[PDB]
Design a protein around this ligand. Structure first.
Ligand SMILES: Nc1ncnc2c1ncn2[C@H]1C[C@H](O)[C@@H](COP(=O)(O)OP(=O)(O)OP(=O)(O)O)O1
Ligand SMILES: [Mg+2]
Ligand SMILES: [Mg+2]
Lengths: 539, 395
DNA sequence: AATTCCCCCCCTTCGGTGCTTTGCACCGAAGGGGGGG
């Protein structure tokens, strides 16, 4: 039935009227389904007939629920959404099974007809008017309006979530020994008090919900493991995701690659070692969503490794508050990192990957710090405590970087682990000039109006070299000058330049770059054993 | 109370919180709702501000802090009786400006009914088990810039009962903290203030004399290399912007030869004269560094290593109002967080308004940890700089 | 043809911002996808 919970007052944006959109021509089977739904909806008081006193309208349509044979009635409240008052959403995230503690008895419940059990504000009911089209196509049409929360309205999800919390508040307050996870109308209930006493406490919850309008049918109420909860497969001692199936097609389109990347990102949370870097770059120039895209034999390689990983069955474990959170990080190359959070060895609470590339110039140490930051904030959400890290970087390497970087960087309590792919700074700029080596006074400048310039060095020994070049800016000329100096040098070299754009790039100690010109400079700065860079005003 | 003309309310999201912070924050709000200071609201209120627990040093208890920075900027200029009644000269001078907590005074005056919507905040949940619990303030909140001004009539009336029997002491109020300075010994300055706390029970230490620094003295050397002279002209061309008139003409004409960086080149008479004279120009601050209240303060921070920092408070580029250094080597965000707090306290005592920080840190690193080592009550408005500075021009 | 709504995530793209050496680096919002209800 309809719950007696007080309705949430809602307003329209100032100076805005209700929508007047027209109904689309629906097909036969959707019209018949809509008339059936609207007839029983009207009998229970969820919708009310209207007439010529209401000038508003909005198209309606239906889709099919996961469990088919049942239709979900939706309203395209797109014009009303632009005029409705703004809301503040209270759902701040998604619960994770890795954050679940071990409970002896567990029960999962689903509220039937969630939205249609919460009343809608009486002053707002006029704007929700719609019109089920003529059965077939000849009669005038029956106009209704919503007395409950409509499906498709921007305010419905926030109103229901607040209403459900108020309904559950009396029960949780008087039963503080029972954990209740609520996501919309999904209810996960688990505790001690073995199944004999657990079911008795569950019937008290269902009776409490029924008194407050909401009904939980026995078809959606699970009593024995495994429990299908929020896409997972909770077991008494472990949890796994619900099965993930990847397409096996041979002609891949842009949309198909996008679908595959999304599923692998979803699967890369309990399955370790998933990489999507080579698959993702296939979308870096595409325009249409239905063009066939070939696989570059590197995306084929990644899709073969990912398919092998997903073939074996993996599972997670439950959080133990009386133990320590440990997170290991591994470098996968090409700016890819993986991590696993565990409390006992070889028993993962959670897994994941980090592959974002921030900035046009970066190195391994900067990326590893970014990976640690992402894990730290993710761990705070799920467990409320930061984990102990096991980074593949030596303490000396980290100590040298953070005492010389111009920014402030920190990593929480961590321990070095000797996983072969170690993180290391590749070169190091000296702090004083080299005695016994040549000095290069190298810089060139281009023109702002013709787009060409020159770049070369002058040495203290008298040698020099110049090369004109076009289609390059003033900044690009300077980088080509420094690169050129490292070219025509020995093993020890002192470089003096008259602009700071190249200095900021080079002192940052990158090992990879999104610009080609910086990349060979890195290949040159690694060969030399001692390099010193000095800046001088342009005079 | 009213909002700034043609504006709206805060709409900032709430960042995740530690379990200990969440557990303490919920308990604080549970005991706060029983008193009427906050009340539960729904999602129909479109405004929100962040919140976190800020347990202070030598307190062993948690304190609720609400980020009201965005609300303060959109709130119509709120007058103490005209703006802020004290502009204390002698607070920046005396000996011992003590900072004490007002804290619970605001939780007596209810807030205007129509303005209560803007002071909305959400308490998160661990592993998102329940939707966030929303609250709004009924009493004056802590952190709002208009909150001290409403209590001013109830604040300026508890000064005379003490400030009239202790005249020369200048008491300054900024947000929920009271600054009071006395040129008394630690034995006296502590006893009298102790009664001030007792005079503020039923009636419901910074030293601004070591503040000056501002040095740019050049290094002294007998054997000068071409690289060293290169490091001087570069340092004395930027310095020609801070101090107009710095003369290096003949300190560069000896750099016209393209020899090595390790050559020991002697200085001519003109170069020695110019180098010696330019020290004198560096002994006097730039003439005409005016402070006008209609502009905003900007405070850069630079990292110098070994736990040493440096800052410059200025309203106009290359017109510095106060340049200083901060000293101590295992936590970097902890040091930077403490440096920000000291700079803000200094700016309040001198000019009365918090500056705009340009933090030398990656953006994402800041929120993850700044709430951990923070111990103040106000929050300065800050922005981040993604650019490596020049060689050490302040070290 | 599709036509809906809120939340989290990832990946790519484009316009605004700041310093400017008027190009180049950062960043946030909007498109696609995954998952949940
Ligand atoms: N596609 C959707 N569009 C809009 N709202 C939706 C959609 N899917 C789910 N919701 C919202 C409205 C539902 O009332 C609420 C709960 O989801 P769900 O249980 O699937 O629906 P329901 O409770 O109406 O059906 P049932 O009676 O079968 O449980 O989530
Ligand atoms: Mg369901
Ligand atoms: Mg349901």
């Amino acid at each position: 039935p309809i719950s007696p919970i007080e309705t949430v007052p809602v307003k329209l944006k100032p100076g805005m009227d209700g929508p007047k959109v027209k109904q689309w021509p629906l097909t036969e089977e959707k019209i018949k389904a809509l008339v059936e739904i609207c007839t029983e909806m009207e009998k229970e008081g969820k919708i009310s007939k209207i007439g010529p006193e209401n000038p508003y309208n909005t198209p309606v349509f239906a889709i099919k629920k996961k469990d088919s044979t049942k239709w979900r009635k939706l309203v395209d409240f797109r014009e009303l959404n632009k005029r409705t008052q703004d809301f503040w959403e209270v759902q701040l995230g998604i619960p994770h099974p890795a954050g679940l503690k071990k409970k002896k008895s567990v029960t999962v419940l689903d509220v039937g007809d969630a939205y249609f059990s919460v009343p809608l504000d009486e002053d707002f009911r006029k704007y929700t008017a719609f019109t089920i089209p003529s059965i077939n196509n000849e009669t005038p049409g029956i106009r209704y309006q919503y007395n409950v929360l409509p499906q498709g309205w921007k305010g419905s999800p926030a109103i229901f979530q607040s209403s459900m919390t108020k309904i559950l508040e009396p029960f949780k307050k008087q039963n503080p020994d029972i954990v209740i996870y609520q996501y919309m109308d999904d209810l996960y209930v688990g505790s001690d008090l073995e199944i004999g006493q657990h079911r008795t406490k569950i019937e008290e919850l269902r009776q409490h919900l029924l008194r407050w309008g909401l009904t939980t049918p026995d078809k959606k109420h699970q009593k024995e493991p495994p429990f299908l909860w929020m896409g997972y497969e909770l077991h008494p001692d472990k949890w796994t995701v619900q099965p993930i199936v990847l397409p096996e097609k041979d002609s891949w389109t842009v949309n198909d690659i996008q679908k595959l990347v999304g599923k692998l990102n979803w699967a890369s949370q309990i399955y370790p070692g998933i990489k999507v870097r080579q698959l993702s770059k296939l979308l870096r120039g595409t325009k249409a969503l239905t063009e066939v895209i070939p696989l570059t034999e590197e995306a084929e390689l990644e899709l073969a490794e990912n398919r092998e990983i997903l073939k074996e069955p993996v599972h997670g474990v439950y959080y133990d508050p009386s133990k320590d959170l440990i997170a290991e990080i591994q470098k996968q190359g090409q700016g890819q990192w993986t991590y696993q959070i565990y409390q006992e060895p070889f028993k993962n609470l959670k897994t994941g990957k980090y592959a974002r590339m921030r900035g046009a110039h970066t190195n391994d140490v900067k990326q590893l710090t970014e990976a640690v930051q992402k894990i730290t904030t993710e761990s705070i959400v799920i467990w409320g405590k930061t984990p102990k890290f096991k980074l593949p970087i030596q303490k000396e390497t980290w100590e040298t970087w953070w005492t010389e970087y111009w920014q402030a960087t920190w990593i929480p309590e961590w321990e070095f682990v000797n996983t072969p792919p170690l993180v290391k700074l590749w070169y190091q700029l000296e702090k004083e000039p080299i005695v016994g080596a040549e000095t290069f006074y190298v810089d060139g400048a281009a023109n702002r109006e013709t787009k060409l310039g020159k770049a070369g060095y002058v040495t203290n020994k008298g040698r020099q070299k110049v090369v004109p070049l076009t289609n390059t800016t003033n900044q690009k000329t300077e980088l080509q000058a420094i690169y050129l100096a490292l070219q025509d040098s020995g093993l020890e070299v002192n470089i003096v330049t008259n602009s700071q754009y190249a200095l900021g790039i080079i002192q940052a100690q990158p090992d990879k770059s999104e610009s080609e010109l910086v990349n060979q400079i890195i290949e040159q700065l690694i060969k030399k054993e001692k390099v010193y860079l000095a800046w001088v005003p342009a005079h | 109370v009213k909002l700034k003309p043609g504006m709206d309310g805060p709409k900032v999201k709430q960042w995740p919180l530690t379990e200990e912070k969440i557990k303490a924050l919920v308990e604080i709000c549970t005991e706060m709702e029983k008193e009427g200071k906050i009340s539960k609201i729904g999602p129909e209120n479109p405004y929100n501000t962040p919140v976190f627990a800020i347990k202070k040093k030598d307190s062993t208890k948690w304190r609720k802090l609400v980020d009201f920075r965005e609300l303060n900027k959109r709130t119509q200029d709120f007058w103490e009786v005209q703006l802020g009644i004290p502009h204390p000269a002698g607070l920046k001078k005396k000996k011992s400006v003590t900072v004490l907590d007002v804290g619970d005074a605001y939780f007596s005056v209810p807030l205007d009914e129509d303005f209560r919507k803007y002071t909305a905040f959400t308490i998160p949940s661990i592993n998102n088990e329940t939707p966030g619990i929303r609250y709004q303030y009924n009493v004056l909140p802590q952190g709002w810039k208009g909150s001290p001004a409403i209590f001013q009539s109830s604040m300026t009336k508890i000064l005379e009962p003490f400030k009239k029997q202790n005249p020369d002491i200048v008491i300054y109020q900024y947000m929920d903290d009271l600054y009071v300075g006395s040129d008394l010994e630690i034995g006296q300055h502590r006893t009298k203030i102790e009664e001030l706390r007792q005079h503020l029970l039923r009636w419901g230490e910074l030293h601004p004399d070591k503040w000056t620094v501002q040095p740019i003295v050049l290094p002294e050397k007998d054997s000068w290399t071409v690289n060293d002279i290169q490091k001087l002209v570069g340092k004395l061309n930027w310095a020609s912007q801070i101090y107009p008139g710095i003369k290096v003409r003949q300190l560069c004409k000896l750099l016209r030869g393209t020899k090595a960086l390790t050559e020991v080149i002697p200085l001519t008479e003109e170069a020695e004269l110019e180098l010696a004279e330019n020290r004198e120009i560096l002994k006097e601050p730039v003439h005409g560094v005016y402070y006008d209240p209609s502009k905003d303060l900007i405070a850069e921070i630079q990292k110098q290593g070994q736990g040493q920092w440096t800052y410059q408070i200025y309203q106009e580029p290359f017109k510095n109002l106060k340049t200083g250094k901060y000293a101590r080597h295992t936590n970097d965000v902890k040091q930077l967080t403490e440096a920000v707090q000291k700079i803000t306290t200094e700016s309040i005592v001198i000019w009365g308004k918090t500056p705009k920080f340009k933090l030398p840190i990656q953006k994402e690193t800041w929120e993850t940890w700044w709430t951990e080592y923070w111990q103040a009550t106000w929050i300065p408005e800050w922005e981040f700089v993604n650019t490596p500075p020049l060689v050490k021009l302040w070290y």
